Design a protein around this ligand. Structure first.
Ligand code: HEM
Ligand code: HEM
Ligand SMILES: *[C@@H]1O[C@H](CO)[C@@H](O[C@@H]2O[C@H](CO)[C@@H](O[C@@H]3O[C@H](CO)[C@@H](O)[C@H](O)[C@H]3NC(C)=O)[C@H](O)[C@H]2NC(C)=O)[C@H](O)[C@H]1NC(C)=O
Ligand SMILES: *[C@@H]1O[C@H](CO)[C@@H](O[C@@H]2O[C@H](CO)[C@@H](O[C@@H]3O[C@H](CO)[C@@H](O)[C@H](O)[C@H]3NC(C)=O)[C@H](O)[C@H]2NC(C)=O)[C@H](O)[C@H]1NC(C)=O
Ligand SMILES: Cc1ccc(-c2cc(C(F)(F)F)nn2-c2ccc(S(N)(=O)=O)cc2)cc1
Ligand SMILES: Cc1ccc(-c2cc(C(F)(F)F)nn2-c2ccc(S(N)(=O)=O)cc2)cc1
Ligand SMILES: CCCCCCCCO[C@@H]1O[C@H](CO)[C@@H](O)[C@H](O)[C@H]1O
Ligand SMILES: *[C@@H]1O[C@H](CO)[C@@H](O)[C@H](O)[C@H]1NC(C)=O
Ligand SMILES: *[C@@H]1O[C@H](CO)[C@@H](O)[C@H](O)[C@H]1NC(C)=O
Ligand SMILES: *[C@@H]1O[C@H](CO)[C@@H](O)[C@H](O)[C@H]1NC(C)=O
Ligand SMILES: *[C@@H]1O[C@H](CO)[C@@H](O)[C@H](O)[C@H]1NC(C)=O
Lengths: 552, 552
């Protein structure tokens, strides 16, 4: 019935119903006019001709290694380039946020209710004749069919970028501070009211939990020593609620910021590394500030670890993902004479696109052992058995799986992949191509253009019939990868903007925050500005083991 | 104890303790350097010489009536001027917010905890030797003494700007959506988690309350008809919690967004006017959108009333307060090519400075009657007795009191003035002069310079001894007023920045919001862009009585 069910309005024009059968597009500031915001304004046509495609730009970022080598060493050029990578993307994210699972038009409820993931594209109205709007059949294809036919791994396909398990677990650990779906309410709701990098996964969402996690001397987090090694405290000692299956002995129930982290030893590894890091920074701060009390030492340390986390993500993590020869930089100052909103809201689609389960291997290989999924999950002995050092050495060596290119979701975790499909539909996601369009990408004209091959395309075609009805999530995992890259174009172009907004939108990047005293002086500031995945592990793991995000 | 107690750092440098007895100032981006951020940089000296004082600028805004008359009629000049008034102030507010009652240094707790009023200046550390830091005596003067000596009204001093009761009650009504101190926690905490103009005082803080207040047809708010006139529903019909003394009969317990509004008939007057307005905009929207359901009609109407509210406040309310000959304009577009944070956090100091109780008259005069405080409070009969029309006519005629200039707090309300003093101290406010310095104002060098007279100055001197120990709140009510103005310099210069930030920071002012479809089309948009205090009363109060914020 809804006359906007067709997504009539293009180039970001907003569709509004003007009577039961008519509609109108608001093209304000889109750069286009006409009934459907498809006729470009003169100034808009220039831009549309002087605008390289993302695939061109990526090509330039991943070639001319010699030229980038020179740029990387001219601080003022490096700054000019990073500033461009930061700002070019800004315009792709609504901020303040707009829509959510229940609101396809702006409302105060949508803006003000922090429990919702926000939405880059509004849901398909409940009374549209098809799931994707007006196109396709009354129902989407059997999710199980799509799962089995183009998603499930036959043979393990390694990531050509050499991503490793140190990377896979870092992504899970880091992303799981802001992806915390509140399943009691539904898939489109969140328990991460911080809506960003606040390290609630170390310190807790709520003051109540934070306080159980704290030692209240020297600003430190409680911890225990086992075989001379530092580890998170126990549930028994802290009373913080954790999710453990009943058969887990009280002494193995580790308490950390995030209630789910006890479930995977990879998580607990990072949880332990970051716990050590926080207490480490405390000793540094106390040294500088014998006048300081427990609160200030604690809060300052937290501010510093937020900085470290943003640094490592941009300069090591995204760096490695990108494959860029240009050396990415974490420098808030680059946005200071620029228009930018220091605020963020986690988008449902960001969450969805970030279900990188293909990363996971068939077995988890530590030292001599090869642990099956069954053996690895909820088994922290494995951690105590080998220790952090051996975990880091091992995970640095084991290659992670390719995410795009299709057929690489481990069977052990198929239920999670099916849910990703089913819950997308539940949330009334628009189609792959609508999302491509929304991110300034050219719609795919056939399934074969999407996959870059024939077999999976043919299966997808038989299932969906029309490319314009293809779904975002599966498309992501099935897409033709960039050359020797871990992802396809859609993943990158949707992901980068959400990612940089959540990184740079954090308040410590704001002018009033981004200064030495915020972090307890120049020595605190330097911890942030010199932080790296290597130092993090080096400072906190015994024998300062070498690590990196790819199998060297 | 704390080295930072004396407030050593100037020009917005941050004080940090470097050892028990030393300190350091972070002057990053202040424009000054040196141990105390007092030595200006070359570029800073130019600015400091080409910068007119606020008292000069005010003079220019309130004279040359002929010139402003021309500027007000050249749309592009009017736009250039308002843009300057908007932006000149921006730099005075920390956004993202920084400090609060418990945090004198930035922390994630301070930033993230939405229950706190933020702070424009950090509290005085708990272990400073004096209340103001290092200056003054171990305790401030008897708050009662200050109350009685320079705050209590002998004779009613009328506002020379001719502010009236329609104005007084509008400020109470409007401000009381974002000033809602949570007294269970303490004076530095708020129940207004919207931290701005969200009209929760009409619609409720929580979804639960909103829903009890709503009719669920045509997007309307419940209401009742009494003697052919429309009024808010009752507590018995709705179950919404209100604050009424026990002797109030169930049929007089009106339910509205803000639990406290039943306490003053002036509040209930506006509460009724805005309730009517909301249902009025619903009829308009249904007419335009017969396709629309109850939710969308309700939410859109709310978006529109937010807009109307921001419009009226800038173009009528602040207009009248300012005394400016320049015609202020509500135009979000003026900030679109500008650096600005669409976000806000209510400052404790804003709350404090807005305790405009001197506005209140000795009696409330409606038609023939002269009601005492005792008779007026919690008495909604008075409203049903005379009706809205007669209330508007009467309150348009009755002059309000002058706020600055001293000795004008009605005795009936002395307890509230004392609390304002006591709770300031409880929250560890810095001194008047610290706050002056913080808003780029020149410290007062004597009490006589503050009051502009001798008698109240002498009393204040005998009480405080040192001008540099004088307190913000009393100073506000006692200050020498601008010429024939309602306020003194300190009130204006502190007040204006907080005020404009809360008005313009609202998301509907953000580019992705400020467009017709957000408000259900050009007809909804036009309601916002033509709204005025007069159109509000006229479309909603029988007889379309003439109203205004000032006495005729
Ligand atoms: C290591 C073994 C893993 C298992 C057994 C697993 C399984 C699951 C399960 C059951 C969920 C939904 C429940 C939850 O919140 O935890 C989930 C969600 C998710 N997974 Fe994983 N996963 C694993 C690793 C990873 C990795 C490496 C990533 C890469 C970032 C990842 C990304 C995500 C994301 C972003 C969600 C959504 C979380 C939420 O909405 O709360 N997972 N996975
Ligand atoms: C109409 C008769 C009025 C009465 C009986 C009254 C009384 C009070 C009382 C008892 C309080 C503190 C009570 C509490 O917060 O629990 C208060 C606070 C306050 N008053 Fe008034 N007042 C009146 C009018 C006004 C007006 C015209 C203004 C002008 C703006 C005003 C400004 C304020 C403000 C800003 C607060 C702070 C409340 C908060 O922090 O949440 N009042 N008033
Ligand atoms: C963010 O949006 C959420 C979804 O709208 C809100 O969650 C919903 O709030 C309601 C309570 O405020 C619940 O509705 C039910 O309403 C009936 C009416 O009479 C009550 O009796 C019920 O007790 C109440 N709940 C139950 C158990 O039936 C919704 O169930 C509730 N949850 C969901 C997922 O819809 C959030 O409240 C909102 N957040 C904020 C801060 O307002
Ligand atoms: C914003 O900051 C507020 C002020 O710190 C927080 O409010 C405080 O949270 C505490 C709950 O975590 C309460 O403290 C008490 O702690 C002991 C622990 O052993 C409990 O037994 C007590 O029952 C608990 N309070 C009670 C009911 O006695 C504080 O009372 C509470 N309020 C104040 C004024 O401090 C807010 O929690 C915080 N907001 C967020 C979102 O974290
Ligand atoms: C979820 C997500 C997706 C992308 C990014 C990201 C950000 C950036 C940058 F440079 F803008 F910072 N690049 N970049 C990126 C670029 C290219 C690839 S690739 N090698 O798969 O084509 C992979 C990642 C980050 C997070
Ligand atoms: C609480 C508060 C305080 C000041 C203002 C304000 C804002 C503005 C402006 F500039 F933005 F338009 N002026 N302006 C203002 C200016 C001058 C006076 S006056 N007649 O007392 O000197 C009174 C008010 C608003 C709210
Ligand atoms: C209204 C005309 C008199 C005002 C000036 C009074 C100076 C302060 O006088 C005070 O008056 C208070 C209010 O009645 C009383 O509660 C106190 O006992 C008294 O000290
Ligand atoms: C917009 O395209 C044209 C108007 O130029 C119109 O025929 C069409 O109906 C509109 N879009 C859709 C989906 O039909
Ligand atoms: C957990 O790991 C331990 C130690 O390596 C192993 O012996 C045990 O079998 C594992 N338990 C499960 C249920 O996999
Ligand atoms: C800052 O002012 C000067 C340093 O230039 C010095 O006299 C003074 O003591 C410093 N701080 C204080 C406490 O005034
Ligand atoms: C309330 O007002 C009514 C009529 O306006 C008046 O007669 C009555 O005395 C007042 N009641 C109180 C409680 O003062």
């Amino acid at each position: 019935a809804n006359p906007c069910c067709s997504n009539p309005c293009q180039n970001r024009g907003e569709c509004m119903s003007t009577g039961f059968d008519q509609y109108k597009c608001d093209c304000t500031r889109t750069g286009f006019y006409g009934e459907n915001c498809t006729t470009p304004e003169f100034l808009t046509r220039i831009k549309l001709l002087l605008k390289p495609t993302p695939n061109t730009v990526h090509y330039i970022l991943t070639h001319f290694k010699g030229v980038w080598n020179i740029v990387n060493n001219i601080p003022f050029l490096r700054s000019l380039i990073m500033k461009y990578v930061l700002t070019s993307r800004s315009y792709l994210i609504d901020s303040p946020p707009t829509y959510n699972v229940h609101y396809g038009y702006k409302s105060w409820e949508a803006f003000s209710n922090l429990s919702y993931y926000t939405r880059a594209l509004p849901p398909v109205a409940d009374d549209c004749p098809t799931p994707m709007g007006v196109k396709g059949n009354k129902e989407l294809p059997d999710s199980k069919e799509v799962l089995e036919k183009v998603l499930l791994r036959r043979e393990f396909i390694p990531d050509p970028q050499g991503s490793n398990m140190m990377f896979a677990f870092f992504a899970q650990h880091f992303t799981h501070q802001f992806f915390k779906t509140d399943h009691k309410r539904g898939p489109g709701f969140t328990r991460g009211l911080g809506h960003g990098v606040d390290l609630n996964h170390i310190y807790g969402e709520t003051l109540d939990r934070q306080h159980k996690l704290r030692l209240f001397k020297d600003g430190k987090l409680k911890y225990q020593v086992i075989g001379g090694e530092v580890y998170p405290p126990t549930v028994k000692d802290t009373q913080v609620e954790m999710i453990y299956p009943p058969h887990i002995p009280e002494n193995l129930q580790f308490a950390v910021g995030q209630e789910v982290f006890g479930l995977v030893p990879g998580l607990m590894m990072y949880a332990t590394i970051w716990l050590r890091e926080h207490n480490r920074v405390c000793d540094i701060l106390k040294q500088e500030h014998p006048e300081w009390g427990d609160e200030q030492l604690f809060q300052t340390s937290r501010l510093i670890l937020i900085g470290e986390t943003i640094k490592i993500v941009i300069e090591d993590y995204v760096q490695h993902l990108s494959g860029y020869h240009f050396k990415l930089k974490f420098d808030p100052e680059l946005l200071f004479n620029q228009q930018f909103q220091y605020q963020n809201r986690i988008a449902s689609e960001f969450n969805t696109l970030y279900h990188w389960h293909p990363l996971l291997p068939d077995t988890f290989n530590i030292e001599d052992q090869e642990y099956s999924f069954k053996q690895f999950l909820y088994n922290n002995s494995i951690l105590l058995e080998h220790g952090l050092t051996q975990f880091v050495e091992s995970f640095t060596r084991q290659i992670a799986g390719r995410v795009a290119g299709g057929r690489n979701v481990p069977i052990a975790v198929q239920a999670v992949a099916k849910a990703s499909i089913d819950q997308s539909r539940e949330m009334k996601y628009q189609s792959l191509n609508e999302y491509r369009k929304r991110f300034s990408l050219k719609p795919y004209t056939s399934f074969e253009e999407l996959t870059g091959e024939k077999e999976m395309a043919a299966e997808l075609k038989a299932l969906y019939s029309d490319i314009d009805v293809m779904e975002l999530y599966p498309a992501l995992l099935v897409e033709k990868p960039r050359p020797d890259a871990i992802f396809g174009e859609t993943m990158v172009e949707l992901g980068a903007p959400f990612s940089l907004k959540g990184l740079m939108g954090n308040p410590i990047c704001s002018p009033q925050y981004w200064k030495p005293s915020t972090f307890g002086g120049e020595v605190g500031f330097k911890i942030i500005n010199t932080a790296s995945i290597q130092s993090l592990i080096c400072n906190n793991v015994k024998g300062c083991p070498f690590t990196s995000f790819n199998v060297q």
